[PDB]
Amino acid sequence: KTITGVFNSFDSLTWTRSVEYAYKGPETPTWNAVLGWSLNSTTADPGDTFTLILPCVFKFITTQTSVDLTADGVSYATCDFNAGEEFTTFSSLSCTVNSVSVSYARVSGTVKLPITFNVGGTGSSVDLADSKCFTAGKNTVTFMDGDTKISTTVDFDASPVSPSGYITSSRIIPSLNKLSSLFVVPQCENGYTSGIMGFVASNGATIDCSNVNIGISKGLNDWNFPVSSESFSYTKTCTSTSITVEFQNVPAGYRPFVDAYISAENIDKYTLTYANEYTCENGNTVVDPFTLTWWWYKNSEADSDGDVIVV
């Protein structure tokens, strides 16, 4: 049978720092959620299942496929990780009650989940929905088990990057062994006449043309991600090494963006070179190409403004 209301509290949510990541954003590894659970042998039996919903959670920061609900060295349940990624706006746990050697009436305990939140990243339906999940500053993070809501408060730092310039982001999709990479054109307050956006992949990355998004967004959120995506006048070419989008008139208040899945040949680094051309209404063409090297980890030296770490 499927039972509900095993997870009964959200105890704490804290960020853990590492060599690579400095600013404490929702997508920044790693957030650790401590949750309270309780099981009653009269209402739950070995093999019964139960699920925890994690809205606005992109993935689990672990290579383990499961985590156990343990108390005093006894494993009372096993919960499989089900990352939302680009499939669903929420992540989940699919848990199963375990047979134990020590009979209990009621037992309670906690579990730690390593997670990163989703506040955008591409023009996909999932990322656009999740771009409205949180705002900079204080938020309430709510998980659900059946109809039971469990929640705690947290403070998310806004991105330190100015939204008015170009925006780049890359994020690993573990189940796919691909990454998504985004490029947002610099802001022209009153609209655009023309431009060229996109990136050329080199140094151990190819572009997956079957998973791309091209749209214009009505502004960006607190972490510089697109919040909407509408069609507009553009022509594009996508090859295994280059995605290039040439666009024409874009209305005021909109930001053109393009993202694609990337296949990396290793988990060391890949390089993207961005064309970055734009002409604001009434203005002159700006041509400002730049190159970034995206790293999966932190390399010994740190390292130029051109070296950035994926999330």
Side-chain angles (χ1 to χ4, degrees):
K1 65 172 180 306
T2 307
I3 55 169
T4 52
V6 174
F7 293 95
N8 56 24
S9 59
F10 203 148
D11 294 341
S12 54
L13 181 63
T14 60
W15 185 71
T16 46
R17 189 249 203 162
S18 65
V19 281
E20 37 277 298
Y21 309 106
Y23 109 79
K24 183 196 71 170
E27 304 191 348
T28 314
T30 299
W31 288 90
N32 272 293
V34 176
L35 306 165
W37 56 269
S38 184
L39 285 162
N40 190 318
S41 58
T42 69
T43 59
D45 297 315
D48 286 349
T49 54
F50 55 99
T51 47
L52 177 73
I53 311 306
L54 293 80
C56 306
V57 175
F58 190 82
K59 69 183 163 176
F60 302 95
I61 309 303
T62 171
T63 54
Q64 308 292 315
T65 54
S66 66
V67 64
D68 286 20
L69 306 186
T70 66
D72 208 5
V74 177
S75 179
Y76 290 96
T78 299
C79 291
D80 292 339
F81 294 118
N82 303 126
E85 296 171 353
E86 295 286 342
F87 310 112
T88 52
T89 60
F90 62 95
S91 299
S92 71
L93 302 177
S94 50
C95 310
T96 304
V97 180
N98 292 336
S99 188
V100 293
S101 59
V102 190
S103 304
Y104 63 92
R106 182 201 187 79
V107 64
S108 294
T110 56
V111 63
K112 199 183 290 179
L113 301 177
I115 59 171
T116 39
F117 295 94
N118 188 7
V119 290
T122 59
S124 66
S125 294
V126 161
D127 287 1
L128 295 171
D130 276 352
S131 66
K132 291 289 185 60
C133 274
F134 303 113
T135 51
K138 186 192 188 173
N139 292 264
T140 301
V141 180
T142 303
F143 297 165
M144 285 191 66
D145 176 351
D147 286 323
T148 296
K149 296 182 172 182
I150 55 173
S151 67
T152 193
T153 49
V154 74
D155 196 295
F156 287 132
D157 289 344
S159 173
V161 179
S162 75
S164 61
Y166 52 80
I167 306 301
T168 51
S169 185
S170 307
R171 181 169 55 188
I172 305 168
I173 309 169
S175 79
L176 296 182
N177 293 137
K178 289 186 175 62
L179 312 100
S180 57
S181 191
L182 174 72
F183 175 78
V184 186
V185 174
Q187 187 179 50
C188 293
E189 207 183 301
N190 287 133
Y192 305 74
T193 309
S194 60
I196 295 166
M197 60 180 174
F199 36 86
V200 176
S202 60
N203 181 236
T206 41
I207 295 176
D208 173 27
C209 297
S210 66
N211 289 297
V212 295
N213 297 294
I214 297 159
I216 48 169
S217 182
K218 197 177 188 200
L220 306 169
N221 69 3
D222 291 328
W223 302 276
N224 299 328
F225 295 119
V227 294
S228 65
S229 181
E230 299 182 35
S231 187
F232 64 109
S233 305
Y234 68 79
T235 189
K236 63 111 186 53
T237 172
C238 190
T239 62
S240 55
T241 53
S242 189
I243 179 166
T244 302
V245 183
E246 179 194 24
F247 60 87
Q248 204 184 21
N249 297 112
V250 170
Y254 286 81
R255 298 288 288 281
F257 66 90
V258 55
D259 56 73
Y261 282 21
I262 301 300
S263 307
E265 281 321 290
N266 55 67
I267 72 144
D268 189 55
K269 60 177 195 178
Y270 60 101
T271 300
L272 299 171
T273 303
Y274 302 86
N276 187 35
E277 297 187 22
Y278 60 95
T279 307
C280 306
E281 285 289 329
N282 304 9
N284 302 310
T285 310
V286 178
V287 178
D288 186 34
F290 64 100
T291 303
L292 297 172
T293 304
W294 287 96
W295 292 84
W296 295 64
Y297 69 108
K298 186 86 202 66
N299 202 240
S300 94
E301 189 190 344
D303 248 7
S304 63
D305 285 346
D307 298 302
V308 283
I309 319 280
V310 302
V311 293

